[PDB]
Design brief:
The PDB classes it as de novo protein. With about 10 residues, the protein is an all-alpha fold. Helix content is about 55%, strand content about 0%. Bound molecules: ethyl 5'-formyl[2,2'-bipyridine]-5-carboxylate, 5'-(hydrazinecarbonyl)[2,2'-bipyridine]-5-carboxamide, 1,3-dimethylbenzene and ortho-xylene (OXE) (2 copies).
């Protein structure tokens, strides 16, 4: 999940 959201970065 963290990665899925942090892809913006
Ligand atoms: C959320 O964005 C998220 C959580 C966990 C994972 C993930 C990807 C790959 C592995 C892996 O290769 O584990 C080997 C033990 C684990 N967790 N991706 C995205
Ligand atoms: N928000 N994330 C990014 O902007 C981002 C773009 C690209 C990459 C990345 C990481 C690793 C590789 C590789 N070939 O191992 C390529 N691109 N990370 C983050
Ligand atoms: C998806 C992603 C972007 C930036 C940094 C990390 C660790 C993960
Ligand atoms: C499996 C994974 C997830 C998020 C960022 C980098 C990598 C190698
Ligand atoms: C999540 C991950 C896995 C393997 C190498 C680098 C990174 C950021």
């Amino acid at each position: 999940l963290a990665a899925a959201l942090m892809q913006a970065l």
